[PDB]
Symmetry: C3
């Protein structure tokens, strides 16, 4: 094997290898970034769902109180107390009880979280396919020993 | 010294061969990953729409019960306490029917939708080629 | 001009093969890590969807119960057209999402068990960060 041609078929292969190395290093970091975004969106959405749930339950508690205050219902009646306890159990889960029973609500999904859920997008990289490497020849030279025909 | 051509060509060809299998398998895998990502992102977008529809319909119901009670003169939505409840519903919001952002297909997908989850076929390590010389 | 030295060539070839095999093993491994993370993300979205369904039916069940209490209390008459639409909206949900135990009685079954709930609040994804492979340097086969 000729040295010149041999180190050419070696530099060619190596250059192709180095492109594949550089591109995969790159693509993997993109893929990692995309995952963090998707995962971030899911955590934001989970927060939004919790916030949504708590506000609906807080509302249920507030309606029973408004109706009681105006004497339309009496929360001491058995069936009404049961509904009230249902709301308190769900609120106890969140909020607090600041003694006076009142439940102070705290959102977990801030305005950035809300915006991310509403209009956030994702960095979606598309890999630029790599061209396969052409087959090589490699030139060969004659050993100086033995008969060389005319 | 002096490496035999024939043999050296075989080593180079074994090497280039495996390399091309790697360029090919990774070329494809990355497009599969890109696809699975798009599906995952579509599922999240569809779930967000479902969450919104679920929330809005419950708030629509709250507004509707308030108006029904007022209508039969049980409550007055302008009274301070009642108006606070009424304002919460307005703030969150067919008279009390909001069209769904998550359609039948959207609902089908978030509940039963499957994924194009490609499992990579491990490429074997390339054996050492012993060049004759 | 000159012939390629055997020992140098074998060297240059093993050197390339060594780097390529590192790439093969590392991509093999990374792709499995990527697949595992996809499954986790997908499972989490599925668990969140289930938690939303449970949240939904519990709120609708509450709506239905208040209507019954108000009716029993005679605050509302379910015969009126508007009150009947409210009742239909709550019954509607129970019928689709709960088991009819007879005579308008329903048993609510949750799709998101403990763990599903923990997973949702717990978070955590096996997020692998690839260790960059170094470019391979030029090997000069004895000569030139």
């Amino acid at each position: 094997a000729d040295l010149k041609s041999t180190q050419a078929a070696i530099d060619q292969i190596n250059g192709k290898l180095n492109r594949v190395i550089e591109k995969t290093n790159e693509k993997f970091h993109q893929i990692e970034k995309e995952f963090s975004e998707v995962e971030g969106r899911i955590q934001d959405l989970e927060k939004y769902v919790e916030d949504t749930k708590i506000d609906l339950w807080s509302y249920n508690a507030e309606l029973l109180v408004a109706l009681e205050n105006q004497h339309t219902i009496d929360l001491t009646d058995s069936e009404m107390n049961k509904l009230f306890e249902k709301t308190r159990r769900q609120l106890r889960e969140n909020a607090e009880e600041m003694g006076n029973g009142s439940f102070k609500i705290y959102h977990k999904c801030d305005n950035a979280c809300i915006e991310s859920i509403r209009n956030g997008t994702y960095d979606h990289d598309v890999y630029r396919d790599e061209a396969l490497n052409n087959r090589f020849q490699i030139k060969g030279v004659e050993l100086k020993s033995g008969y060389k025909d005319w």
